[PDB]
């Protein structure tokens, strides 16, 4: 008789190895104190 | 038992396409406007001696 060969059971030659891409990464604007609160950290302004 | 066929390699990805193109990369303007002004005034001065 005839039979798929999905009837035989399959072992592998093959050596595996696994890569993956980098993903994507967006960078956000990030300031520890912008120039509105470093210029506002002073006590009087003399402009004002 | 009986060897696994040849896989489905991967394809290299169609790559980015880029415009070639000319920029101006504008800021917000934190610069006061500057222009020329002259005063006239007059010192005026009252001693009492």
Same mark, same amino acid.
């Given at each position: 008789? *005839? %039979? &798929?060969? +999905?009837? /035989?059971?399959? /072992?592998?030659?093959?050596?595996?190895?696994?890569?993956?891409?980098?993903?994507?990464?967006?960078?956000? !604007? %990030?300031?520890?104190?912008? #120039?509105?609160?470093?210029?506002?950290?002073? %006590? %009087?302004? $003399?402009?004002? | 038992? *009986?060897?696994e066929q !040849?896989?489905?390699?991967?394809? #290299?990805?169609?790559? *980015?396409? $880029?415009?070639?193109?000319? +920029? /101006?990369?504008?800021?917000?303007?934190? +610069?006061?406007?500057?222009?020329? +002004?002259?005063? $006239? $005034?007059?010192?005026?001065? /009252? &001693? *009492?001696?």
């Amino acid at each position: 008789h *005839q %039979l &798929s060969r +999905a009837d /035989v059971t399959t /072992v592998s030659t093959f050596i595996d190895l696994n890569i993956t891409m980098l993903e994507d990464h967006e960078f956000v !604007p %990030l300031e520890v104190y912008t #120039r509105h609160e470093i210029k506002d950290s002073g %006590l %009087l302004d $003399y402009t004002e | 038992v *009986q060897f696994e066929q !040849p896989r489905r390699c991967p394809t #290299r990805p169609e790559g *980015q396409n $880029y415009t070639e193109g000319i +920029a /101006v990369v504008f800021k917000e303007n934190i +610069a006061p406007y500057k222009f020329k +002004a002259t005063m $006239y $005034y007059k010192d005026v001065t /009252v &001693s *009492q001696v």
